Amino acid sequence: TQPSVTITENLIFPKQNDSFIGIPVFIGYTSSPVDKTAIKLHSLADFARSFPESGLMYYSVRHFFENGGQQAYVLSLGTEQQLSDFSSLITALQQ
C-alpha cells in the first residue's frame, strides 16, 4: 500500500464552469426514483451516477452526448413502473 502508480476503474467529476445558450431538459420516467429537483449532467458519467444505464431515458441522454452535447438537465416524473398509456403521460406533464 506504499505510494505507487495504479490502474483504476473509478471516475472523477470536477466542477465545470462553461456556459451555453441552449440547454435542454429531459422530462420523463427514469430507471430509479429521485426527488423533485432537476439534476445537471456534464457527461454520460453523471447520468450513470444518478440512474442505472437502461431504459429509454438513458439512451436518449446517451444519444444527446454522442452527437456533440455538453450539458443537459434531467427531470424525472417517476419510476418506469408507473407508465400506463398515452393519456396518463399527458396528465403527468400537466402537473
Helix (H, G, I), strand (E, B) or coil at 13: coil
Closest approach of Cβ 41 to other proteins, in Å? Answer: 17
b (16+ CB within 10 A) / e for 65-85: beeebebbebebeeebeeeee
Binding site for other proteins (CB under 8 A): 1-8, 10-12, 14
Question: Cβ closer to other proteins: 2 or 19?
Answer: 2
Q: Which three cell numbers stand for residue 72?
A: 443537459
Question: Cβ closer to other proteins: 3 or 68?
Answer: 3
Closest approach of Cβ 45 to other proteins, in Å? Answer: 10
